[PDB]
């Protein structure tokens, strides 16, 4: 199956460069174009550039030659390089494969990688339990606090538990660090018996934390 996956740095300091790897599978890069498109948080989409099956590139002029793209067909990797990053370059970056009928529409996308342009330091999360009340549907969760930059992900019981999960948008606190909660409602009856573990990943800091959540 056609798949693309980006790997990016999380944080870039202002004026420095961004490198993102798009690893693909399911198709040959010698035969399809791959494009880069980005989306600032909460905003719309901006096409950045493409590299043709054959190696040629074309770039959006708005990027003022700061952006280049290269690839390694043999290892199924496409690489975005953009110099001189500033605030407007904070965004989720996607690589995408275009259709063949080439059509510049984008039939397959990677999950994207968020790049935050900031002079601050990466900081991993503390993960605290939201323990289900002893006082029948019960709620429990994990509070994921004090990390930077975004994002984190949270799954429960390694993905086994998905139903009734709600992971909220993070909020940036005055300290410049983010805080997020993830909760789930479950039957009271499972609490003595069911084990509930929130699995937290913060890729910018290469940090993973599991947290067993229990009645106190």
Which residues of the shown chain bind other proteins in the complex (CB under 8 A)?
35, 44-47, 58, 60-62, 94, 96, 99, 101, 103-107, 109-112, 126, 128-131, 133, 135, 137, 139, 141, 143, 145, 166-171, 173, 179-181, 183, 185, 216
Shortest Cβ distance from residue 172 to other proteins (Å)? 9
- In DSSP terms, 210 is beta-bridged to 199
Q: Which is nearer to other proteins, 118 or 126 (CB)?
A: 126
Q: Which is nearer to other proteins, 73 or 185 (CB)?
A: 185
Q: Which is nearer to other proteins, 31 or 212 (CB)?
A: 212
Cα gap 11→112, rounded to integer Å: 14
Long-range contacts of 64-71 (CB under 8 A, 24+ apart): 67/36, 69/36, 71/29, 71/34
Residue 139 Cα to chain centre, angstroms: 27
Shortest Cβ distance from residue 16 to other proteins (Å)? 25
Angle at 89 between CA 18 and CA 208, to 5 degrees: 60
Q: Which is nearer to other proteins, 74 or 135 (CB)?
A: 135
Shortest Cβ distance from residue 25 to other proteins (Å)? 16
Cα gap 127→179, rounded to integer Å: 10
Pair of tokens at residue 204: 């910018």
């Amino acid at each position: 199956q056609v798949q693309l996956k980006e790997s990016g740095p999380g944080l870039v300091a202002p004026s420095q460069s961004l490198s993102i790897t798009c690893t693909v599978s399911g198709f040959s890069l010698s035969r399809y174009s791959v494009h880069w498109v980005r989306q600032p948080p909460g905003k719309g989409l901006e096409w950045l550039g493409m590299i043709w099956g054959g190696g040629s590139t074309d770039y959006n002029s708005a990027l003022k030659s700061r952006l280049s793209i290269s690839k390694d067909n043999s290892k199924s990797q496409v690489f975005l390089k953009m110099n001189s990053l500033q605030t407007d370059d904070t965004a989720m970056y996607y690589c995408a494969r275009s259709g063949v009928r080439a059509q510049a529409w984008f039939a397959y996308w990677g999950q994207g990688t968020l790049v935050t342009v900031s002079a601050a330091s990466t900081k991993g999360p503390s993960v605290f339990p939201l323990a289900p009340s002893s006082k029948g549907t019960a709620a429990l969760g994990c509070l994921v606090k004090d990390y930077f930059p975004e994002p984190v992900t949270v799954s429960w019981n390694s993905g086994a538990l998905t139903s009734g999960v709600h992971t909220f948008p993070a909020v940036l606190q005055s300290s410049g660090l983010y805080s997020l909660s993830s909760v789930v409602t479950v039957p009271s009856s499972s609490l003595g018996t069911q084990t509930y573990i929130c699995n937290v990943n913060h890729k910018p800091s290469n940090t993973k934390v599991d947290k067993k959540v229990e009645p106190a």
